[PDB]
């Protein structure tokens, strides 16, 4: 590749550079020169004679839906008649080359109507949200008129059109709202660069490039980039987008058609000047005058002379370059005609006020139009008034204003044709060019289009005034002899940077291909010699691939030199540096970046900042005009900031101009205005980018100064003056009076309105100002810091808004920057973006982040929250370190001995060796080192190794030693995750029970089954909760006491959630081992821990038997790559992150398995489809599938989902909770077998996987939390476990993990992932339940016992090592004792408050009844307190459901995004309505789901899983409610609760008839059952089979299974007897004996169809008194075959009473028996 | 807005009181 000089290659002078060589003039033309100028007149060409069978299309002759939007028109014109077929019937790319004013906008509307007609829906409605149309217009003044006209035309379709102007966030909502977006090429391009088009890019079906010939105007870069991007996007995503280009008649149009992907045979329509609907004569004038004054003098009489030709017969429209020139020209022409011979007599032609009367009536204006209007003259320009412009428009439309001079905005801004139009000057000032340049070609064409009214004009000539030196160009342009060329060459590097930032071109090859779609490539192909390419060079490479490579190399080296993008010569890959990303985002040329880099420094002063801004390459051309040099001087001494290093250079001019704009100084000079505008609009971008540039480098001072300058530029304010000017409503003089007082703003907050008024001496508005004081944003900050390690902290920041929210002043949301700065305050340790939404205002927000520290602790860190667009709106909080105790430094990890690998034959027993000899002959070094200690010694051991090191083999070593020690022994393996428990159970069932014939069991929910399994089994797999339930009452249960081995897995999880339970059970096992006088060996397995010594001491592991290995001792070396993206919005983040997933897959693991973990189940499908479409984009198709589809078909037939079936056929599969377990098993088997290569899994499924891959990708490291309504990071243990999956030891030499995260968390991941992490106990927060449980079982009998019991926990070990993490002040034994005493005192006080325990003498504690209920069912104590408080003696099933849904166990249920709409829809469906509920409250969701499930209705499958979880947790809560109600002695609420249990298991309302229990039954079946007389299942059990058959439609299965259910339905017969009912007296005990029999022998569990989990029959026997609503006695039982139950109570007074005995089920409705008996 | 999900010979009998609790129009 060679370096080509861009400057030589590019043709200069912009649009003026003419490819035309000679400009042959048409036959109907002539040229004539008088005095110093020459006029060339080309009469209107007669319209082309209509061809045979050619006729204009009647409006009624087109499709009916398109009839609307064409009202007021009799027929389409000739051009529209030609193009209607292609526009409306075919979906083909179009290029219409017609003369201006020929109605090309209507062709665009026909295309838009086509796109609309693709969505006619039904009943004359349009799918509003199904499509979007992009209309690109060159001039904003045209954009507004396009918006207005299209809104008027397309109103009947219910379709909204709007301009795209505004802030990007405002643009986001604007686009989402509307369907047709009209915008400028620059606006659309910048929105695309910013990524704002990403969300709706799939809804854009039609794009219209109006005035597509503009390319030559040096906007060609902006437009070419857009079109090439769209075409290349079409090829990449295979999606179809239709492009409609509208152009003027010009040479080489076929090249544009090729560039537009337009078929010349079908989609190309070209019309010459003849096709002009209304004939017009083009009249050019060229002045040869050299000196400016005489040339300008000549122009006046030129205009006057031509004006007099159509003085009395034709409305003349004159155009002028500038807004002020309009009135000057009007006054000059009026004076010229009046002074000489008074030509104005007929130039107005009042004809005795035949027409003038209207203008004489309309003279009542208040502008300079008042003078001109009576004479017939008028001026129309931007500004004036809105009413004035429409007035002059309407008055001109009625043929009143004979002569109207206007600006260029009239042509675009409103359809106002005229007979004769004359353009004067054709010389406009360009601020970008910093000089006077001739106006754009396109503007000339558009202006000429207006000339000639469509139906009132036979032919109207048009006149142009220009210098004679530029005549040919104009001629060449309007005689269609001037071809269109490309200016891509000059602007190339910026376009390349935009592409690289977008990610379209990863490597230089992609950029070389990308140039293939550019119009520059086509032009170089057609005319190589024009673009600096020799003919022999053209013959060299036909496609010029080498040429493109050359330019790519040059641009890449230039960009690398500025460090915008890293470029490597060896391969050619492009690496996006962050600076380049900023530059692309803010339209900054590479030179400006090269200047900022060598100018910006951390110590820049404000003056120096303004100077640095002035040197931007955007203004590299601007100069200082001498005529305005005097004026600049008076501005200089008025601006606040001194401007040094300035002698009135361009930098000085820019600096003083910007300062004047900020200070809102008025200026008297026209020229400055242009410059004044150009800098200001520019400044807003640059000042932001600089901020970004300095925000990333973490410069604390310069960032604050730059952000303050951005806010000043936006608000036109100086920080010195009062911030209250930010409210436009406040009267200026009042704010000036406030500023006169040297009264600081914050002191306003504490003053009342009357005090404010008397301070300002204007009490009348003193209240209003007060209001504004409380409208200013203000936050309150609190900081809670915890030292995680010796080097890093964890700071939680609580933000509390302290201001009334007003949607007018504030808006939909507010933005803030959180900055953490060191003691010097010269560097930013950590920065973050915070968004305060309007909906969640006045709600405390919690933000947790990690900041680093160093060994010499500085006194303070400063936390500053700074508003993003409000001045003087910062809040600073000093975080102090004078009382901080860092954690003790951890000892070095255990070194890895280089021992000789251990053969499997080391194990003595051959049977044991048979277990492993097949898999491998040698152990990995970790287990070779551990084997001696574990297998050959009997003592507690701790093994800390990175996950994937086979610690389970060490656990099996311990188990084998136990089996060798005793033939029958018990081992208990506790693993924190349920899915891990299942996996381990399967593995050891394969390994132990099958080969060694030793019992292996897995614990379940039911306590009796758990007891049976513990009694019979030898290996007991369990999770912390399941084992906790059993071990709580270890004193009574002998089996728990004597177990030979206790293995804990994932010991490090105790730090995370569900850690307290694991810690409690481990401590209880240690206590049992100490108490039983028979040591219980403990084997702990965990990831590498920094504080391994604390855990080993806690579990009793000796110093020599503690193994803690570094994370670098992984058997398979791990390569971790963290990729940080600086995007705050989550959806935008993921949408931009989708492509780097595929790029990383290609770069790292091309031909090896890949696993991608995403945040949410919904996101899984989208990511799988996006990766698939990106793969199909690339040259290699379905490379992710290695097997054959014939082998896939047997597997695919088992699948049910359609999207998953489609994805598998290409080689990508996805896993989530929704998939059936069979489907997940099949996909995991497919992935393991190597058929597919990439699997996308939901992160919540990470634990439950048995498949490992060569590459693991982490998608976002964040997830949405609905309860907190915020995004939270993954737990570090969770992320580490995900990283552990990249472990294939047999084949892969190393594993690779790419973690892609937000840039804020990037440093923290580096800190923790690489080396051992610390674990801290959270037992202090979740301690009430455990103390209650211990008190229930009499383990704790007083406060001293609880204090002693706390010593066994890991919390007691940590509090003496990391004190400040647990709010400890000191480290002495006294401080620890005081903290333990205070903590236990608080917990026992809470328990006494909830009546769980009784505290006597402030020393002893005893268990109360509520405590026994809470501990018996393993229910959180808060829930039992709530049940006790809320339940009364009159609650029905409605109140019971409401109470149960309020239980604490449902607090952790998830609230996903967008669920609120579905939930609000569901809330109406349910039978019982709530009382104004908050739909983000989890309890409300649980109540709604319970009501939905009870009613048997079905919801969307995603929400369905939550219902299974809720029902799983519900039954114990219902039983607890029953127990509480029985304790309180209430009959009706207890019966209601029992019926609630029955109905929740059978999923039916109480009112609903019993029949609904039976399977395959419906309301119609039940109705046919009803009238017969069948109401209960028992009669069906008593139905002669034929009658059940004939009455009920059936199959084999319907009768078979329904009758079988009848068998399962429990019919049981009971007899009661009151023992010694004769010899009984008041106050004596009363005993009743009940006999229960089931002749049928029970087979299996309850047949619960809808209830997910398996359940058994539970029965309640209740003796009550119905009249008093009092529950005398109750007993729960389970009926196996038969039972003999005793009930007892105390007799009341006065002898005789009559109780009722209730026998109630809990799984089947209808079998509740009642028996009435008397006493005494 | 959504739909509602729906879902040998035994003649064994013995003389019995067969008393069940009334619905009570709960």
Numbering used by the authors:
A (entry chain B): 406 to 2125
B (entry chain F): 336 to 342, 357 to 375
Publication passage describing the model:
FBP21 enters the spliceosome during formation of the pre-catalytic B complex together with seven additional B-specific proteins and leaves the spliceosome again during the following activation step, likely facilitating ordered transitions toward a catalytically competent spliceosome. Like TSSC4, both proteins also contact the SNRNP200 CC. Notably, the binding site of TSSC4 binding region 4 (residues 303–318) overlaps with a binding site of FBP21 and C9ORF78 regions at the Sec63 unit of the SNRNP200 CC. This observation supports the idea that the SNRNP200 CC serves as a latching point for diverse intrinsically disordered proteins (IDPs) that either function during snRNP assembly (TSSC4) or during different stages of the splicing cycle (FBP21, C9ORF78). Instead of full-length FBP21, we employed a C-terminal fragment (FBP21200–376) that encompasses the SNRNP200 CC-binding region. These observations indicate that TSSC4 exhibits a higher affinity to SNRNP200HR compared to FBP21200–376 or C9ORF78 and prevents binding of the latter two proteins.
For instance, the U5 snRNP 200 kDa helicase (SNRNP200; Brr2p in yeast) unwinds the initially extensively base-paired U4 and U6 snRNAs during spliceosome activation and releases U4 snRNA and all U4/U6-associated proteins, necessitating re-assembly of the U4/U6 di-snRNP and the U4/U6-U5 tri-snRNP after splicing. Both helicase cassettes comprise dual RecA-like NTPase domains, a winged helix (WH) domain, a helical bundle (HB) domain, a helix-loop-helix (HLH) domain and an immunoglobulin-like (IG) domain. Only the N-terminal cassette (residues 395–1324; SNRNP200NC) is an active ATPase/RNA helicase, while the C-terminal cassette (residues 1282–2136; SNRNP200CC) is catalytically inactive and serves as an intra-molecular regulator of the NC helicase activity.
